[PDB]
Amino acid sequence: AYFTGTANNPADLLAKVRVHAESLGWVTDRASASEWLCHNADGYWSFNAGANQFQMAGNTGFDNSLAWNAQPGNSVQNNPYSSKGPTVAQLSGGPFTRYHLFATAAYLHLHVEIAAGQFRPVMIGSLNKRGVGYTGGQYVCGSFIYTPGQALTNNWSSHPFDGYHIQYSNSSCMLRLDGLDGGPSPEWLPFDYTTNVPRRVVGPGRGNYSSQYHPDVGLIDASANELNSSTTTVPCAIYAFGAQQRSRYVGEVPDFGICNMAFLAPGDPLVVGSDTWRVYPLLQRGTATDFDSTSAWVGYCFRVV
Amino acid sequence: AYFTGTANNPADLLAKVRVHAESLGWVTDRASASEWLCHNADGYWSFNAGANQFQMAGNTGFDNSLAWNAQPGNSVQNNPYSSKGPTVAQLSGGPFTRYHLFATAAYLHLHVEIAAGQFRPVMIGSLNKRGVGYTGGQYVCGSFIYTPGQALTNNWSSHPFDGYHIQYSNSSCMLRLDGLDGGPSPEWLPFDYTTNVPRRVVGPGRGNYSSQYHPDVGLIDASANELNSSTTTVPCAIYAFGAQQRSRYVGEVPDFGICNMAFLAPGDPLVVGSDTWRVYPLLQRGTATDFDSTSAWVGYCFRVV
Amino acid sequence: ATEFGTAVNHADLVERLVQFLTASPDLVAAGQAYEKVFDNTIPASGTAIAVRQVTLRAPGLGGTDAIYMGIQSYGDTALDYYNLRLMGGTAFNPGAIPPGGDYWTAFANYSPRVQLLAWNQPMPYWFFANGRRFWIVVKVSTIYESAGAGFILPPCPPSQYPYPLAVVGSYRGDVATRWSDVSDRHRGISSPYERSCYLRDPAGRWLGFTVDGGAANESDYNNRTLLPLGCGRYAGSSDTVVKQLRDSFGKFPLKALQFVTRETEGRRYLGDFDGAFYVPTLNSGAEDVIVEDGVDHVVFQTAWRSGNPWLYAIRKD
Amino acid sequence: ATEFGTAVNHADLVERLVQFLTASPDLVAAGQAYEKVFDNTIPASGTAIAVRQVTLRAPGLGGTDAIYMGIQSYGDTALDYYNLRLMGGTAFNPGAIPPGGDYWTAFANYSPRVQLLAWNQPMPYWFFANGRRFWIVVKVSTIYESAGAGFILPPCPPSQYPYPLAVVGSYRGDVATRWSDVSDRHRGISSPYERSCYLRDPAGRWLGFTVDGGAANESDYNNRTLLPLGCGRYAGSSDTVVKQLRDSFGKFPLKALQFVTRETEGRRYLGDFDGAFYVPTLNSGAEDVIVEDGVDHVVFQTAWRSGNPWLYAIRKD
C-alpha cells in the first residue's frame, strides 16, 4: 500500500516499482531493465527510462515486434497535436533523496524527492467512473520543468492535470476518452487549453495559478481554515471539451485531493474521519506569491491505507 | 428592597414611598400630605408634590420656619444658574399604571409607569466614594418632558445625569461637590454643558444621543453582544469640570447601569454572576434612530436584592 | 417533507406552509415539527392587504438546537403586490416590540429581511422542509420564484460552531418590489446579488455573499462570494467551463454550491447547501426530475433569465 | 513576574527576557513557565546584525490553554536599527518553512508582525509577564517605547471563545524603521494607529483597532476603535473631558482600556486590557508609581509625545 526507500538512479526506482507491482499482482506483458509494456484490467501502459527522465505513453493493444512508442492505438499518433509526442517526466540524473509509492490494483502513484526540497510526482491510473458510462478514463501524468535557475513554474511549464500551459512539443499529462463526437474509439486527449482544438481536456493541476481555468481553484485556495486550522480534501474534477464547445464532466481522480500547505509541513498528518491522509508538496515550497521559482503552497494529498 | 404597586395620583406614590422609607428606618424631620423635609446619615433632601409634577431640592441644614424651597444651603440660591430654580420632575395628571421602587439606607430609586409605554424615573442618593476623599456626593434627579406630541427627546429636553441640554430655567438633576476651587462649602453643581460656567458636572444621562458628551457612550452603544446575546453593566461615571476646564472623575452611580434594549423587553431578567439585574426603559421604546419621539433603546439596568 | 400543489392566494399559501410544517406525517412522526411562538397582525390596513406576522421555533434533527425564524406577509393593492418577507434570529422577545414600529427588531442578532414575490391568485407551489432547513419555490407563469433558510453543513464539529444559520432570498427585503420587475438583481438562490444571501459568521456576523460585484453593495462583501458560480475571479475570459457545462450521455452532473470568504485577514471554508445543486440548461429545464442513486432532484431557473449559469436543482428526498 | 534592570544590548535584552520567562521564581513555583518550541538563526548576516528567531508556547494559568508566540530580532548595523519583531499564532510546524523565505508563515492562522525598537547599547528595561499575557517597556532616552501581547478578558464563558489572543506594538512590523522616527504612526499601546494592535476575532479573523482613522489603513478597521481614547466619534468638539482628565485630590483614577466593534452587520463587546489603564499626565509622568488598594501601577508615555491622550499606566502586581 505505502512504500518508501532510496534510489541513486532512475533505474533503481524502475526496478523496485516493478518488483512491487509484480508482488501486488500487476500483469507485465514485457519487462526489461529500461522498457516496459504492462497492463491491467483497466488499460495498457508503456514506460521507458531515460538518462535523466521517464518517457510514458498510453496503449490499447500489444505487439512485441513494435517499439516502446509504436504500440497499437498509441497516444503519439492518436492525439490532436501536430508534434505527435508522448508524455514526458523530466527528472534528475543523480541520487534521489527519497520516494513514496502508493500501489493499488487500479492505479499507481509515485512521489520522488530527487533532492532536498525538490520533488517529482508521477501518476498512473484510471478515473473513478462514479456510475458514468464511458469507455477509457486511463490517465498518465508526468512532471516537466521549463528551465533550472530561471522561473521554474513559468507559463510555458506543464504539470500533471494542468489547465494552462504553452508548449508545442510535449505534454505533461494525458487522458483517454473513447468515441468522442463520433470519432474513432482510440482517442488520447491531452491537457491543453490554448490550442483551440475541437477536443481537449482540462484539470486543476497547477493548483491556484493566476490564469488557471477551473471553478474549484477557489476551493483549493480556501482549503485551509483560519478558524480551527482544519483542512478539507477537494475532489479533483476533470472537464472535457467537445466539438461544439460544450463541456462535459467526466469524473474525479481516485484517492487524490489538493490543499494549501500554508500551515503544514511536507508529510504532516491530519486524519479527517476514519481515513488517513498524506500531504506532500508538488515541486518545492515557497511563499504565497512565489509562482515563478517554486510551486507556491500547492499540496498533493493521498489517502493512505 | 423591591416594591411594586399602583397609584391613581402622585399623592398616593408620596404616601407609599414615605411609608416604605419610614419602615426601613429613614429619618423624616418633617412630614406632611404634600411636603417633605427628610434626611439620613449622608445628606438632607426636600420634596414637594404638585398637581402633576414633583419638586425636589437638596439641603444642608434644617429650619421648620422656612418654606420647602428656603432651607439652609438650598440648591435654589447656591447654584451657578441665574434663574435659581430647583429640580423638577414633570409627570402626568396622576393616573399611574404601576410603580417600581428600590429602597436602601443610602439611596432611593423610583420608576413609575404613568401610562402604557410611558415611564418617569426619580433618583435620590449619594455616589459611591470608592475611596475618593470629597465632601458631598448627594444627587437628586428628575424627569422633564419638553412638549407632548412633538419631539419628546428634543435638544431642549433634560434627563437625569444628562450631558447635553438647552434650558435657562430648570434642571433635571444636580450633584453636590463641596469646596470646589476654594469656594464656600455649600455648592450644588447642576448637569449643564452649554452655559460655559466655570464649575459644572456632566453624565451619561441621555445614553447614546448624537451630541452626548461622555467617553463611555460607546460602551453603552455596544453593551449588547451579538455573539451570545449577552449584556453587561457599564458603570455610570460622572465628571466634574474645574474653574478652568480641568475635569476630575468623581465616582459611579451605586447599583446603577445604563444598557441597550435592542434585544430585550421591559423588565426581562438576565442574571450576570450571583447578582440579579432588573431592566426598565427610561421613557418609551422606539427604533434605533428614534431620538425625537421616544427614548430609543436606552436602558436602566439595576441590581435587585 | 415535500408537498406540491396550488394555493388560491398568498394567504392560502402561508397557511398551507404552516400546516405542512406543523402536521406533515414525517415531521410529526419524527418529532421534527416546528413550534409557533408568535402570530399577530399589528398594522391597520388601509389601501393594502392584511399583514400576517409569524415567528416559529426550530429544534433541528437532534432536538438540541435552538433556531428561530420569522415570516411576514406584506402587500399593496394600488401597486398590486403581496410580498412575503423572511428573516432569522437566535432569540425572540415579544415584549421587546416598541409602541408602533415593528417586531422583527426584537430578534436577537436581527438580520436584514429577504422576501418572496407573489400575489392573490391560484399559484402552483412546491414545499421542501426538514428539521434544519426549509425551501420555498413558486411557479409564476414562466417565472420561478424561490427562497429559503436553514443550517449549512460546515466541515467542523458543531460543538464550537453550533449556529450556522443561513438566509437566502431572490431580492433584498429592505424595499418593496413588484414581481413583474425584469431587473438583473432579481435572481435565484444559486446566484445571490445585492443582499440576496446572508449567513451567520461564527462570530455572529451576517456576512452577505454575492456571486458578482456591485458598486451599490458594501465593499466588504465583494471579497466573499460563491465560488462555483463565481469562477470569473480567476478565469481570464468571460466564457468559462461553468457557463458551457452540459450533461454527459444523458446523465446530469450535480455540482455542490460552496461558501467561501477570502479577505486580507484570513481564509476559511464555511459549508455547502443542503439539497441545492447546479445543473445545465440545454435539453432540460424547470419542473424536470432526475434520479441519482435513488434520490430525486427537481429543476428550477432564476426569474431574470433561464441561462446555463442561472439554473439550479433542489433535492426533494 | 516583574523585572527592572539594564540590558547591555538588544541581544542581551532578549536573553534576559527569556531567562525571566524561564526561571522567574513566581513562574517556576506556579509552573507557568513557557516552552521554547523553536530557536534558529537562518539568515547569513552581511552588513547587518545576527538575526535571532524564537518561538515559545504558553500553557496559561489553568494549564489547559494552548498559546503560541514568536519573537524575532532583526537589525541592520549600517542603518543602526536592531528591531525586535513580535507575532502570535495558534500552532507551529518547523517543517512548514519553505526553502528560503521565512518561518513566521508556518504559524497556523498567522498574523502580521508588530515590533519593538532599540539598538545595541546598554538599555534600561521593564518586563511584565503572566501566564496569559506579557508586556515589554524600554526607556529609549527621550523616547519611551512599549509593546506586548496576550489574552484579553471577554465577559463571556471561555467555553465558546477560548482564543482571545491580542498582539499590540508601537508600530507595524511590515516595514523597517529607525527608533528616531518622526511619524505620527509611532505611538503606544493605549492608542494604536496604522496596524499597531491586532485582535483575533472569535471567527479567527485578526481585527486591528485604531483610535484614529487613516486613508492608508483599510476601510474596514475605521469603524472599530478603542472607545476611551476614541471619544471623538460621538463628541462634537475637538476638546473633550478625556483630554482634560486630571487627578482628584492626589488620587489618580485608573480607567480600563476598551475593545469594541461597531460595524453595519452588528455590535459586540470583546474585552479589556489586563493590567493596562489610562491616566493623566499632570503633576506626573513616566517612572512614577501609584498604589491603589495595595497594588502598584507604573506610568509610561508614548513615543510620539507625553500628552494627556498620549499616556497610560501598567499594573505591576
Cα within 13 Å of Cα(C97), Cβ side = 14
Task: Say which of B213, B228, B232 has its CB closest to residue D241.
Answer: B213
By Cβ distance, the residue of C228, C245, C269 closest to A222 is C269
Q: What is the CA radius of gyration of chain D?
A: 19
CA distance B161 to B257: 12
Cβ distance D204 to A226 less than 8 Å, yes or no, reads yes
Which 64-123 residues of chain D touch chain A by CB within 8 A?
90-91, 93-96, 98-101, 105-110
The verdict on D268 touching B (C-beta cutoff 8 Å) is: yes
Method by which the model was determined = cryo-EM
Q: At CA B15, angle to CA B13 and CA B16, rounded to 5?
A: 65
- List the single best residue of A236, A249, A291 to mutate versus C (max C Cβ within 10 A): A249
Burial class (CB in 10 A: 0-12, 13-18, 19+), D157: exposed
Handedness of CA D113, D116, D121, D125 (dihedral sign): negative
Give the dihedral sign, CA D263/D267/D268/D272. positive
CA distances from B121 to B100, B112, B173, B205 (A): 10, 6, 11, 12
Torsion of CA B2, B3, B9, B11, to 10 degrees: -80
| Chain D and chain C touch, per 3+ beta carbon pairs within 8 A | yes
Which helix (H) or strand (E) segment holds residue C16: the answer is: helix C10-23
**What are the C-alpha distances in Å from C245 to residues C144, C228, C254, D60?**
21, 12, 11, 54
Q: Which long-range contacts (CB under 8 A, 24 or more apart) does C191-195 make?
A: C191/C226, C191/C229, C191/C302, C191/C309, C191/C310, C192/C168, C192/C226, C195/C112
Task: Count how many residues are written for chain A.
Answer: 305
As a whole number of angstroms, the distance between CA B71 and CA B46 comes to: 9
Please give the single-letter amino acid code of residue B104: T
Report the C-alpha gap between C134 and C150 in whole angstroms: 6
- Give every CB contact of residue C39 below 8 A, 6+ residues apart in sequence: C52, C53, C54, C55
* Residue from C217, C156, C161, C220 nearest C192 by CA: C217
Of D301, D39, D32, D37, the closest CA to residue D186 belongs to: D301
D170–chain B nearest CA distance, Å: 24
Question: Measured between alpha carbons, how far is B264 from B224 in angstroms, rounded to an integer?
Answer: 9
C-beta of residue A110 within 8 angstroms of C-beta of residue A99: yes
Measured CA to CA, the distance from residue A37 to residue D56 in angstroms comes to: 55
> Which residues of chain A make contact with C245, given a CB cutoff of 8 A?
247-249
Of D207, D264, D268, the CB nearest to C218: D264
B101 and B120 in contact (C-beta within 8 Å)?
no
Inter-chain residue contact C204 with B261, CB threshold 8 Å: no
- Whether B contacts A, i.e. 3 or more CB pairs less than 8 A apart, is no
Which of these, D250, D255, D261, lies nearest to D312 by C-alpha position?
A: D255
Candidates A85, A36, A84, A42; CA nearest to A64 is A36
Whether residue B215 and residue D228 make contact (CB cut-off 8 A), yes or no, is yes
CB distance B263–C98 less than 8 Å? no
Please give the grid coordinates belonging to residue C46: 388601509
Q: Which residue type sits at C80?
A: D
Contact map slice: A 221-260 vs D, CB within 8 A:
225-229
Q: Which of residues 119-178 of A touch C (CB under 8 A)?
A: 131-134
Cell numbers linked to C130:
426538514
Is A203's Cβ below 8 Å from some Cβ in D? Answer: no
Contacts C248 to A, Cβ<8 Å: 132, 134, 248-250
Report the distance separating Cα C110 and Cα B56, nearest Å. Answer: 42
Give the amino acid at C179.
W
In chain C, residues with a C-beta closer than 8 Å to the C-beta of D204 are 202, 266, 268
Instruction: Determine the Cα–Cα distance for residues C133 and A46; give it in Å rounded to an integer.
Output: 52
CB contact under 8 A, D218 and C268: no
Please name which of D311, D268, D316 lies closest in space to residue D286, comparing C-alpha atoms. Answer: D311
Q: Which residues contact B23 (CB under 8 A, 6 or more apart)?
A: none
Whether residue D266 and residue C109 make contact (CB cut-off 8 A), yes or no, is yes
The beta-carbon neighbor of A261 closest among D91, D96, D99 is D96
Q: Rounded to an integer, what distance in angstroms lies between the CA atom of residue C290 and that of residue C313?
A: 9
**Nearest 10 degrees: CA dihedral of C170, C106, C98, B261?**
-140
CB contact under 8 A, D234 and B212: yes
Distance CA A173, CA A166 (A): 13
Contacting residues of D for C266, CB less than 8 Å apart: 109, 204-206
Q: What angle do CA C108, C111, C115 make, to 5 degrees?
A: 130
- Within 8 A of C240 by CB-CB distance, chain A residues are 213, 215
